[PDB]
Structure formats: structure tokens, C-alpha cells
Amino acid sequence: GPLGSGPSCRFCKDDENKPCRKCACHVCGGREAPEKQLLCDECDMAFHLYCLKPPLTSVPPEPEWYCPSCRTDSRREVQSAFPKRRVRTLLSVLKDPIAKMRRLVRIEQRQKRLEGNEFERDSEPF
């Protein structure tokens, strides 16, 4: 059967007016509540509080959060005992048109340049 076409994003290229796994929820590939999704700290990808995890329905109080694969893949060894900040969320990013476009262009370029690195990987783009 035929494939979809339209104005294309640069990490999923499906449609800029539609939700994706990297534009919206990485776990359902959609958007419904843009005020109940978490962001990784390595990928900055969205994750519904009710798609990403079965137990809790609310965002943690801690200083950093990465996707459940990244958090299992030894990126940090332990939970934090000091509240330096709270984790990143769409209720913060998606609730601002600049934080939206910054996470969608600025972050997408951060990872997409690393996927085809022109120099050593410690290039400090952020």
C-alpha cells in the first residue's frame, strides 16, 4: 500500500502537523494530554505518564529523568537525595511555543548531528 506525504520533520519525516514517537509520545506515537508527558535528559523525547510506566500517574520530584531504556542502560547508578531541580515535562515545554520549537529543532539537531558526527563526540553543542 501507499505511504503518507506532506511537510516533513527531520528525525521522523512523517508530517509536522501530526504527532510522532520523537515529536510526541515515544510509547504510543501520539498526543492526547500535552500536559501529562515526561522528557528524557539524553534524548528529550515525550513520554505519557500512563504509557511510559504502569505504577504511578504523576511526574517524579527528582533532578533528572531519562527514558526507561536509558535509565536501565546505566546512565545514572542511583536515585538522588538532593532536590537541585524537578524533571522536564511537556506541561512545561509544550505549554510554551518557544520551548516546543526549541526542543523540536534545537534538540533534534543536537542528536541528528551526533548520529553523523563531524568531530569527536565530546563536541559540546549544548
- State the residues that interact with Zn ion by CB under 5 A: 9, 12, 20, 23, 25, 28, 40, 42-43, 48, 51, 66-67, 70
3-state secondary structure of 122: coil
Closest separation in Å from C-beta 45 to Zn ion: 6
Give the nearer residue to Zn ion in terms of CB position, either 25 or 93. 25
DSSP β-bridge partners for residue 39: 46
Query: Residue 83 CB, nearest distance to Zn ion (Å)?
Result: 22
Shortest Å distance, C-beta 8 to Zn ion: 8
3-state secondary structure (DSSP) of residue 71: helix
Q: Would you tell me how many other CB atoms lie within 10 Å of the CB of residue 48?
A: 22
SS3 47: strand
Nearest alpha carbon to residue 57 among 39, 36, 28, 73: 36
Q: Give dist(CA 27, CA 19) in Å, integer.
A: 12
Shortest Cβ distance from residue 70 to Zn ion (Å)?
4
Q: 12 vs 91, which CB is nearer to Zn ion?
A: 12
- Cell matching residue 3: 505511504
Of 16 and 86, the one with the shorter C-beta distance to Zn ion is: 16
Residue 11 or 86 with smaller CB distance to Zn ion: 11
